[PDB]
Amino acid sequence: AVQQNKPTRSKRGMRRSHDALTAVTSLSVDKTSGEKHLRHHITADGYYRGRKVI
């Protein structure tokens, strides 16, 4: 099963339109550390909801 006519750049772009990326809606800030981390995840130092775990 192979193609019979060469597709176009328009069709290629239409197909790739749904292949885009979605960025992060917003970031979270720790109450005491003031950093920026992902939602429900820990920071790069070991802070989560103000407490220290590392």
Partner 1 sequence: MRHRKSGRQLNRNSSHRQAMFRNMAGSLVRHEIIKTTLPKAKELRRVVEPLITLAKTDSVANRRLAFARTRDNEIVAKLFNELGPRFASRAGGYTRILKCGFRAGDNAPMAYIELVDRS
17 secondary structure, DSSP code:
G
Contact positions vs RNA (CB under 7 A): 1-5, 7, 18, 24-31, 38-41, 49
Alpha carbons 54 and 51: distance in angstroms, whole number: 10
From the list Mg ion, partner 1, RNA, none, partner contacted by residue 28 (C-beta under 5 to 8 A by kind): RNA
11 binds Mg ion (CB under 5 A): no
19 binds Mg ion (CB under 5 A): yes
The distance of closest approach from Cβ of residue 16 to RNA in the complex, given in angstroms and rounded to an integer, is: 13
φ/ψ region of 49 (left if φ > 0, alpha if ψ in -120 to 50, else beta) reads left
